[PDB]
Amino acid sequence: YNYAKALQYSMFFYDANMCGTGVDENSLLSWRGDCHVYDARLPLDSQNTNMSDGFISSNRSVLDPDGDGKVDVSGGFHDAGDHVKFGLPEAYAASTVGWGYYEFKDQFRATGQAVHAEVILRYFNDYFMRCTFRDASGNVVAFCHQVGDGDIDHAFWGAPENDTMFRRGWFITKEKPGTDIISATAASLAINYMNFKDTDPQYAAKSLDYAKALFDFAEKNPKGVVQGEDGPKGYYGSSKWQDDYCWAAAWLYLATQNEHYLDEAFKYYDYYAPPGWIHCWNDVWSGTACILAEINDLYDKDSQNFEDRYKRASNKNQWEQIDFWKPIQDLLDKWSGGGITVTPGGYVFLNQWGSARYNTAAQLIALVYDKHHGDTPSKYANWARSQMDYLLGKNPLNRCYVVGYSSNSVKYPHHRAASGLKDANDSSPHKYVLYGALVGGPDASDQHVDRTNDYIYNEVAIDYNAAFVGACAGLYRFFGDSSMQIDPSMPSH
């Protein structure tokens, strides 16, 4: 149960999912090369994209300044074990990994893993920026949130480098709401600014500029979530846009101290939501609550100004009790204190689809709470540790759910590239080790089937590994020893 090594390994899943013309330059995995490079030359028309003929006609000079009739929506990361790039979870992974790097930068540095983190975060955010088509004044005209289609992509199984199937570009326009994805993306870029403002001021400024523009687009235009027919159909069904909107707003206030953003956050912030679910691609209310609480600690610790402003904004009585950290304390008491179902084996299980993804998100929140409350481990961090240790092998199957981490790790993740096979049903060993991938996890009875075609319990994804990265760093922060060394034989930048 070496958290330094866990942190190191955790990011390699991202190298395995890098997409586009920049993968041999950015990925540390020799078995990954440039893929879907035709994404970089997507034809600008109403069939290869989902923008109307009229929209393209009126906006051609901004969408295609050079006039070669093609746009570049290449880059970023494949979503899961598949090759589609879905906007909602793409932004969730980018912001959540960024969220962890922002909170525990000291640990990434102490373990020599900060450079790896920055390469991954730059790859996520540079993709978002290239996909944000703005006029010269900075106004967002269109945002490509998805490349590919589950309906088409899932019908194939092979290395991404050899794929040639149709990969449509889906764009958000002022003609139809896309508030959830636009906001989720703006949040990531605002976090990118926070992560690079001291280290690369110019790059940070660019990220912040794009973040503010995206948020303004979300703010100014009619509200709604991107619909299934406009790209994610049943793969990533979005519940709402208000949490992503508030998440972006909170981060933008942190980045700019422009009161307007805090006012927007307070206008839609559901104080009752955090304790309900946990941080995930379809609900970032808990993460939002954490940021608003840190904002309060930073700028309004000894007074009730922010609390009273929030009550006025969400029309609550002035005497209602509001403590920005309380919703998260409730969430954590629920997760660490017996509120959420725990398996006979001692694993806190929300539900079977990506239980590990939910568990590690709770771990992250637990570690962030302790950091901001004396920066010392409490029952929350201690609980988080018990959960990470379960996932690392302290369970009924003595099974490590992080592939490649140990001899007892799962070995057959549901992943096209790593498998090196032509069919998920083929039971042969994988040609490559998908180091650091956190699989769906065990079922409610601590059982697990380690097969390439077990798409529930062996599923892997950018959103699955997102909070997991931060949790490892957070655990190293409070529990790392001199005995916890990174693996010197792993590829490095």
Picked from Ca ion, Zn ion, none, the partner binding residue 64 (CB below 5 to 8 A depending on kind) is Ca ion
348: helix, strand or coil: strand
Q: Partners of 454 in the beta sheet? A: none
Say how far apart CA 262 and CA 332 lie, in whole Å.
Answer: 25
Which pair of structure tokens corresponds to residue 480?
């790392």
If binding is defined by CB under 5 A, does position 68 make contact with Ca ion? yes
**Residue 376: count of CB within 10 angstroms of its CB:** 9
- In the bound state, the residue with its beta carbon closest to Ca ion is 300
| CB neighbours of residue 32 within 10 Å | 22
Give residue 128's region: left, alpha or beta (phi > 0; psi -120 to 50). Answer: alpha
Q: Which two tokens stand for residue 152?
A: 């088409």
CB of residue 99 to Ca ion, shortest distance in Å: 15
Fill in the per-residue mask, 146 to 185: x = in contact with Zn ion (CB under 5 A), - = not in contact: --------------x-------------------------
Nearer to Zn ion, 22 or 377 (CB): 22
Binding test (CB under 5 A) with Ca ion, winner from 1, 24, 38, 64: 64
Q: Nearer to Zn ion by C-beta: 87 or 393?
A: 87
Query: Which stretch in 14-22, 105-113, 142-150, 180-188 sits in contact with Ca ion by CB under 5 A?
Result: 180-188
- Span of 131-139, 174-182, 426-434, 442-450 interacting with Ca ion by CB under 5 A: 174-182
Q: Each residue of 132-164: b (16+ CB within 10 Å) or e?
A: bbbeeeeebbbbbbbbbbbeebeeebbbbeebe
19 sits near Zn ion (criterion: CB under 5 A):
yes
Minimum CB distance to Zn ion, residue 17 (Å): 8
Q: Closest by alpha carbon to 121, among 75, 182, 167, 181?
A: 75
At residue 438, the 3 state secondary structure works out as: strand
Stretches 11-19, 295-303, 393-401, 450-458: which one binds Ca ion (CB under 5 A)? Answer: 295-303
Among 4, 11, 28, 35, binds Zn ion (CB under 5 A): 35
Q: How far is the CB of 456 from Zn ion (least distance, A)?
A: 24
**Full DSSP string of 211-223:** HHHHHHHHHHSPP
Choosing from 270, 300, 308, 443, the residue that interacts with Ca ion (CB under 5 A) is 300
52, two tokens: 């109307």
Considering the complex, state which of residue 17 and residue 179 has its C-beta at the smaller distance from Zn ion.
17
With contact defined as beta carbons under 8 Å apart, do 193 and 205 qualify? yes
Compute the half-sphere exposure of residue 97: CA atoms within 13 Å on the CB side of its CA: 30
d(CA 256, CA 191): 11
Query: What is the Cα–Cα distance from 128 to 111, expressed in whole angstroms?
Result: 28
Q: What is the DSSP string of 450-467?
A: --TT-TTTTB--HHHHHH
Which CB atom, from 149 or from 219, has the smaller least distance to Zn ion?
149
Residues in 318-377 at the binding interface with Zn ion, rule: CB under 5 A: none
Q: Does 32 bind Zn ion (CB under 5 A)?
A: no
Work out how close the CB of 421 gets to Zn ion at its nearest, in angstroms, rounded to a whole number: 18
Helix (H) or strand (E) holding 121: helix 114-130
Instruction: Report the distance separating Cα 337 and Cα 276, nearest Å.
Output: 14
Report what 66 binds from Zn ion, Ca ion, none; CB cut-off 5-8 Å by kind.
Answer: Ca ion
Which of the choices Ca ion, Zn ion, none does residue 149 contact, using the CB cut-off of 5 to 8 A by kind? Answer: none
* Residue 8 C-beta: closest distance to Zn ion, Å: 24
Which residue's CB is nearer to Ca ion, number 126 or number 180? 180
Among 78, 279, 414, 415, the one annotated catalytic: 414
Told to judge if 116 belongs to the known catalytic residues of this protein, a careful annotator would answer no
Q: How far is the CB of 78 from Zn ion (least distance, A)?
A: 6
Q: Which of 66, 198, 229, 375 binds Ca ion (CB under 5 A)?
A: 66
- Note the residues at the interface with Zn ion (CB under 5 A): 19, 35-36, 160
Catalytic residues: 414
- Note the residues at the interface with Ca ion (CB under 5 A): 64, 66, 68, 70, 180, 240, 243-244, 296, 300, 306
